Every structure is written in C-alpha cells, then in structure tokens.
Design a protein around this nucleic acid. Structure first.
Ligand code: CL
Ligand code: MG
Ligand code: MG
Ligand code: NA
Length: 328
DNA sequence: CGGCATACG
DNA sequence: CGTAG
DNA sequence: GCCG
C-alpha cells in the first residue's frame, strides 16, 4: 500500500526515517555529481518512500514490497540498521571529489558541468577560484562574493520583511498585483536557502511587462545586490536588514498570468522531486503534458483551465495534497 | 530494453 | 552554460 | 538503480 509515484502519497516535512533518507540522499547527490541522472532519481525516490512511511523502519523485512527498493538501496538500509553506518555512504562523504563538487555546485552560477571542469583542472577551494576571477562569469563572481551569506539559512522572520518590501515595489509597478509566498516556506519549512515569490494580477494580461518594472523599483530602493538585468523569472540577491547591518539573501521573483497562476503556484511550491513525479505521472499514466504554465491534452490539442491547485489534482485523478504534504 | 520533467535567462 | 521547483 |  505504498504507491509508486511520490505525488500519490502525502510526504510531511518531518518524518520517522530521517537518518535513512539522508544516507540515500548522499548517494543520490553523488550520482548527480557523476552525471548518473537515472541513479540519482532512484536514490531520491527510495529516500522519499521512507519519508512517507508512518513509522521507523527497524528491520530489513519492512522494505519488501516498497517501490524503488532493490538490492542497492536495501543493502544501504541494512548496513545502517545493523551497524549505524553504511561504508559506501561514508566513503562518498570523505571523498575529495564529493566534497569539492558539493562546495563548487553550491556557488550561485556554478552547475555540475562547471564544477566538474574546475575539478579536473585541479581546483579545490573557493580561494582557488578567487585567484583567477577573469575566468568567472559575472553571475559566478556574485555567487562567490556572497557565498558566505548565502550559506546562512533564511528564517521565517526574514521572509515577512522581504515580502513587505516586494509588495511595496509591486504595488507601485502595477496597482492590484499580488505577491504569493511559494517554495519551501509554503510547504511549512521554518528555514530556507532562498525566498520564492509568485506575482500575478487578477485581470488577465495586465501582468505583461511587470517584472522589469518591479526590479527597476527594487534596484532604485537600494535593495538589489545582484540580478541579471522582457522576462518573467528573476534570480536575485537582496539586501536584508540585520541588527546594525544586513545580509545577502537569494530571492526568486516569478510572474504569471492569472490563467496560469495555479500551474505556476504548483510548480514553484515543489518539492523538486514532487514536481518531477507529478509531471511523469501526468504524461505516463494520464497522457497529459504538465508544466508550470498549463496542462495539455495532446490528443484533443487543448489546455485545461484551472482556477485552483485543487482543479489540477482533480484533472490528473489524484487525491489533493496540501503544500505541507508535498515534501517528497 | 527505454525511460527517467520541463521549463526560462 | 546557468537558473527554477 | 529501479520499474514496467
Ligand atoms: Cl544513471
Ligand atoms: Mg526556495
Ligand atoms: Mg528558488
Ligand atoms: Na550552483
């Protein structure tokens, strides 16, 4: 009675198998660092299955019949249950390759392919990167300059303050436009790496051209430490007040027309695995194509209208899950 | 075996 | 190539 | 790495 797709089952933020899921997610991350997207997906899916269980796994027996647990993931769990550590996981953790790829990929502007190239060139530390800055993109220069602040968690107190300043700019840019908190905070997280906001307007079409107007106003208020600048997604670094000072915070701003707002809200609320699984479910089980703009029936060549996330779950024949249960 | 989500900057 | 969930 |  464990469904195979993560979007078919509630996954709360906190659960009963934290240590086991964390170990599998190390292997998933390492698989991604080597370009093994299929193995990354299986380890992520197996980890997420454990997050959805109603109690702790105490015996290997309890994995039988669970989807995404075969010989490899079962052996990892068996060793953690019997010995408290998995040798494979500890070897990954200790490896120079894992540690450096993790360090490099957590820089804003650096992905797996860039990190891997730097690794092969012999680079290992952030100061190694700062010693050859003409090699860096301006986005990477920003990510490196701000790396320390961006490594500090954002608190829910921080979010409320940023939401207020974003609403002020949005209101001047387009009266009546609204700002909705999305991402991990909408799933109930008390901390985050960034803050995600979704912007729309109740009159279809009025949101066209909005984001440049919003960003120009935030920049004029001195709040933008970095951004890339027609566009509809902005990946920014904001100045957030602190006692006697301030800190840099990643903020994403997205604009959607109100007709697409439920699809954008669903996508930007995540989790990442939940959205991948939902889109896979849509296509492979229902023959419908889902993204953050809409839901397409490729046979009738028609888009589904949705007025709510509830509509979208119903369209897909899935029982509704609130954001707090999408923590796959 | 093929498949593994699907966009925008 | 990077970014997003 | 696992599923269908
Ligand atoms: Cl793979
Ligand atoms: Mg976020
Ligand atoms: Mg984000
Ligand atoms: Na990065």
């Amino acid at each position: 009675w464990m469904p195979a797709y993560a979007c078919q089952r509630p996954t709360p933020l906190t659960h009963h198998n934290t240590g086991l899921s964390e170990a599998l997610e190390i292997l998933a991350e390492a698989a991604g660092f080597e370009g093994s997207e299929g193995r990354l997906l299986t380890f992520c899916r197996a980890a997420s299955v454990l997050k959805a269980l109603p109690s702790p796994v105490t015996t290997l027996s309890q994995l039988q019949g669970l989807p995404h647990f075969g010989e490899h993931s079962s052996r990892v769990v068996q060793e953690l249950l019997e010995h408290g550590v998995c040798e494979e996981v500890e070897r990954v953790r200790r490896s120079e390759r894992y540690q450096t790829m993790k360090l490099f990929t957590q820089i804003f502007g650096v992905g797996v392919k860039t990190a891997d190239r730097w690794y092969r060139e012999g680079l290992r530390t952030l100061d190694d990167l700062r010693e050859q800055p003409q090699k860096l993109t301006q986005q990477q220069k920003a990510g490196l300059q701000h790396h320390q602040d961006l490594s500090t968690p954002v608190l829910r107190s921080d979010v409320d303050a940023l939401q207020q300043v974003v609403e002020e700019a949005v209101g001047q840019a387009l009266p009546g436009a609204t700002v909705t908190l999305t991402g991990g905070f909408r799933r109930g997280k008390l901390q985050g790496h960034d803050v995600d906001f979704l912007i729309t307007h109740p009159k279809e079409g009025q949101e066209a051209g909005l984001l440049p107007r919003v960003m120009c106003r935030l920049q004029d208020q001195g709040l933008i430490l970095y951004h890339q600048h027609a566009f509809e997604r902005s990946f920014c670094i904001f100045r957030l007040p602190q006692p006697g000072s301030w800190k840099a915070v990643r903020v994403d701003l997205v604009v959607a027309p109100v007709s697409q707002f439920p699809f954008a809200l669903l996508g930007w609320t995540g989790s990442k695995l939940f959205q991948r699984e939902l889109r896979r479910f849509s296509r492979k089980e229902k023959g419908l194509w889902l993204n953050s703009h809409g839901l397409f029936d490729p046979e009738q060549k028609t888009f589904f209208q949705a007025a709510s996330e509830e509509d979208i779950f119903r369209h897909l024949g899935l029982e509704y899950l609130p954001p707090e249960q999408r923590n796959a």
